[PDB]
Amino acid sequence: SSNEIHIGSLVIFPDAYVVSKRDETIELTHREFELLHYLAKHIGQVMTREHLLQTVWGYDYFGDVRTVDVTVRRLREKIEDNPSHPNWIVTRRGVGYYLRNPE
């Protein structure tokens, strides 16, 4: 099942392919949603760009790993109040990324 995930005031509706923060809907690209949605399925788990790449982009996709960085930047600009210190999408320096479990 997959009706909707809540993370703080951030809501994910996998079925409708929709996201809202504080109730405001946020327009995301297909890719952006895919990534955010995947991190929301594994809340609080750190994952490498290498892993996220094949997982969200596909095992057949061998483009550069910075695409995950580019996509995480865009999600931050679109979702974070202040991207300088993300509240949801966090960087585990030298390892990868993860969606933060609000305590």
Curated annotation (Swiss-Prot):
DNA-binding interval(s): 2-101
Compartments where found: Cytoplasm
UniProt PTM: Phosphorylated by WalK.
The organism's place on the tree of life at top rank: Bacteria
Biological function: Member of the two-component regulatory system WalK/WalR involved in the regulation of the ftsAZ operon, the yocH, ykvT, cwlO, lytE, ydjM, yjeA, yoeB genes and the tagAB and tagDEF operons. Binds to the ftsAZ P1 promoter sequence in vitro. WalR has been shown to directly bind to the regulatory regions of yocH, ykvT, tagAB/tagDEF. Activates cwlO, lytE and ydjM and represses yoeB and yjeA.
Subunit (UniProt): Homodimer.
Protein name, UniProt field: Transcriptional regulatory protein WalR
Gene: walR
Part of the intact protein present: 131 to 233 of 235
